[PDB]
Amino acid sequence: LGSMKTERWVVREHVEGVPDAARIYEKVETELNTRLGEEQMLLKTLYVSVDPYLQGICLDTPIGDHMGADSIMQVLDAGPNAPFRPGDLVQGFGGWRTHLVSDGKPKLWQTGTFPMVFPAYRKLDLRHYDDALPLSTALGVMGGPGMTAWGTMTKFMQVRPGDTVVVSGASGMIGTLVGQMAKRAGARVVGTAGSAGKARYLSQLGFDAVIDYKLADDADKMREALREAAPDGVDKYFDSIGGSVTDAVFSMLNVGSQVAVCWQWATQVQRDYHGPRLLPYIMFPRATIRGIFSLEWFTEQNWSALHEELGGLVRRQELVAHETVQDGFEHIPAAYQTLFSASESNRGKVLVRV
Amino acid sequence: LGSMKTERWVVREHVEGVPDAARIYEKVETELNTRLGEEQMLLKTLYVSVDPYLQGICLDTPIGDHMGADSIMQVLDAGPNAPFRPGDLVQGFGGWRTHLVSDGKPKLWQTGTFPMVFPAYRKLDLRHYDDALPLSTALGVMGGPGMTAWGTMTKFMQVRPGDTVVVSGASGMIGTLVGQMAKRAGARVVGTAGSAGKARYLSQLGFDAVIDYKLADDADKMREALREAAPDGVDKYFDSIGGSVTDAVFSMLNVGSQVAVCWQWATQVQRDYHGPRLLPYIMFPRATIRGIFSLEWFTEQNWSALHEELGGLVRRQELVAHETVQDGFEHIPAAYQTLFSASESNRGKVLVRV
């Protein structure tokens, strides 16, 4: 009847808007019972992801509980019917915890806005990873974010040569992957970034035009920047921002256009709940708008196609998937903070190697 | 060579909001030159359509111009290179005029909000019509509105047995037609209507619930009636109204739900331009939203299809395509006004026999 010392980051306090990592999260020591049920496993956390969607996960986490997050774990011990053996690497929602016990089965997010179901843990096979595509990429381009970009661009958006594609929130991993895929499919690609460096970075990834969303702060100034960046209209919009940039894009939708709603940062994070009605603007364009919830694509078939298609382009150097690996379980909230407010210096997926 | 006296309804004044049809329009005598260019035809108007979408056509029509509308016409006289011969019957955007000279070719709506192109005149064939499917159906179930409903239900929405289908604006020919096709695919069809007498007309047509949209002023009041009317949520939504009813339906979208946007009466007519941001409610449901602009389906193949699929069911009494034909050219604007003020007595498509 043993037990082990583990550390955990827990939700101290609920604060909406831009969260203040130093204030919401407290690092505690915790005794973990190492006694396993017949198909439970004891796991060690090797990497964790920090993502903006955690802001609204946290505001749904009971005070005192650990911060959920996507992670890479190694099995230390396992009961006789556990899905994985000791040594196996898994990707799943381990959280900001050094170690944990779980059977890796799918689990409801009880206190979520929706009845969301966190996926079963995914076995990672080392043959898929090398120095060009390290194991850590199971939290980025070979993970949720990659699956979001690749799934949208191959199961919904049909970018054609000549199209103008708008990507809001382009500086992040998903945005840059969508842009680079769109460019490969032959499109003019316009993005929004948040400073001259980031906008230059997107220009080095192949974006044809980059608009500063800090300068163009309202839909009118934003309408101006789009009309200059996209003079023939918008065929495809990959939206992570919402708000007044999305209001702007909807005024200039072309016929048969397609909008993918991946996130609404300006609503979720900036509490912008009311705005110009958008549906009156989509009838003549005959525009199709599809909500994106990439969990529906987490199948073994899609993960292989991901590693074939997307892993290939990354390895042949036809496609840049950049990540930023902060070291140290104790710097997890400092890494998370650098997503909001400190996006300067931040390229791609931010991970923490523990 | 020669001329003939005609009457025309012209736009004398622009009035926003709900139309004042007696203040907007003026009936004039107009001498038409009847000397025909080589592809021009002289046509005589048999029926005209009055529709809510005419409110926007009007506001885009220069003062003094004639009011455009959908009509059934008959070729009196035709140049040698005309597309049709005298005696031929055609459906086209002839307008509130007793006679006109046109060449039947597609025409750009110069002054539109959108660069829309009115279609070429479409020859009708009297063989195709009997007492069950009168010639006037070329302005209803065998015309515009019929092609809007049928096209949506066979080209976009995949209604499957067990769905809950919600139709805002259900009393008219389009909502009525959607519901009946949805019911034939196994759905539970919920609607809205404005009376008790139409509420009972829809139910008797096979609707399982009918909210009264006048009782339901609010997005709150509308959620409650919907929750009741559709307890398992919405999988399909045919929207003609927008506004607060649409804000309600978007709060209870099921997974893989489809929304088709037909009109936004609440914004177009009632001038409600702001509301809750709706896009942030579609991501988890993976809702698909498609603007409708049925002009895209006006193809020869699609008409023959519409005749055969619907003309069967309508004729065999399995599909109710009622119509309300007002008599008298001098009454066209009064018939148009009832769509907005006195619909309690209308049934299906409103036309005017000239």
Ligand SMILES: NC(=O)c1ccc[n+]([C@@H]2O[C@H](COP(=O)([O-])OP(=O)(O)OC[C@H]3O[C@@H](n4cnc5c(N)ncnc54)[C@H](OP(=O)(O)O)[C@@H]3O)[C@@H](O)[C@H]2O)c1
């Ligand atoms: N529905 C789904 O299935 C799904 C799946 C995965 C992810 N998501 C969500 O979708 C988003 C996209 O992923 P990502 O990796 O591309 O995220 P991300 O870009 O890392 O999010 C932060 C970035 O967005 C930019 N940004 C911040 N505030 C902005 C604003 N108000 N207007 C415009 N841009 C702004 C910043 O660019 P600068 O650095 O240039 O300031 C920053 O680098 C994430 O927020 C994630 O939570 C949804």
Ligand SMILES: NC(=O)c1ccc[n+]([C@@H]2O[C@H](COP(=O)([O-])OP(=O)(O)OC[C@H]3O[C@@H](n4cnc5c(N)ncnc54)[C@H](OP(=O)(O)O)[C@@H]3O)[C@@H](O)[C@H]2O)c1
């Ligand atoms: N996008 C396209 O391609 C396309 C093509 C054709 C038509 N449309 C539009 O689609 C709509 C449907 O066509 P239709 O022929 O069936 O017209 P309709 O529904 O007969 O239009 C007027 C009717 O709508 C109802 N109504 C008025 N205000 C309402 C409200 N606030 N909420 C709910 N219902 C309300 C009234 O019904 P009660 O008598 O029950 O009050 C009235 O009978 C029209 O708006 C039409 O212009 C679009």
Ligand SMILES: CC[C@@H]1C[C@@H]2C[C@@H]3[C@H]4C/C=C\C(=O)NCCC[C@@H]5NC(=O)/C(=C(O)/C=C/[C@@H]4C[C@H](O)[C@H]3[C@@H]2[C@H]1C)C5=O
């Ligand atoms: C173990 C795999 C992990 C599980 C994580 C759960 C993550 C998903 C859920 C994360 C947060 C959430 O659901 N917050 C409350 C709603 C706010 C807001 N409204 C939405 O509709 C929405 C999303 O729809 C997000 C989708 C994320 C997509 C992302 O890809 C998933 C992560 C995935 C990589 C929002 O954020």
Ligand SMILES: CC[C@@H]1C[C@@H]2C[C@@H]3[C@H]4C/C=C\C(=O)NCCC[C@@H]5NC(=O)/C(=C(O)/C=C/[C@@H]4C[C@H](O)[C@H]3[C@@H]2[C@H]1C)C5=O
């Ligand atoms: C000759 C065949 C005729 C040609 C007519 C032209 C009619 C179409 C045009 C009618 C009005 C219009 O274009 N008004 C300006 C936009 C306001 C508002 N925004 C929209 O996107 C919209 C429509 O999307 C309308 C679609 C109608 C659909 C209708 O069915 C067509 C008529 C059709 C039956 C709106 O109403």
